[PDB]
């Protein structure tokens, strides 16, 4: 459950992990 806004980066982790879990960021960087 996130804004899909910390998806752009080659390392989305470095945006998503401040407000979301590794489960979420795993889906935005690579995709599971």
Write the layout of secondary structure elements.
Elements: H1 13-16, H2 22-29
Overall 3D form: globular
* DSSP E strands, number: 0
Number of domains: 1
Question: Percent range for helical residues?
Answer: 25-40%
Structural class: mainly alpha
- Which value, in Å, is the CA radius of gyration? 8 Å
Strand content: under 5%
Largest sheet: none
Terminus-to-terminus distance: 15 Å
Number of helices: 2
Element-level helix/strand string:
HH
PDB class: signaling protein
Keywords: water-borne pheromone, alpha-helical protein, disulphide-rich protein, signaling protein
Assembly: monomeric
Entry title: NMR solution structure of the pheromone Ep-1 from Euplotes petzi
Write a structural description:
This protein is mostly helical and 32 residues long. The protein has one domain (1-32). The chain contains two helices and no strands.
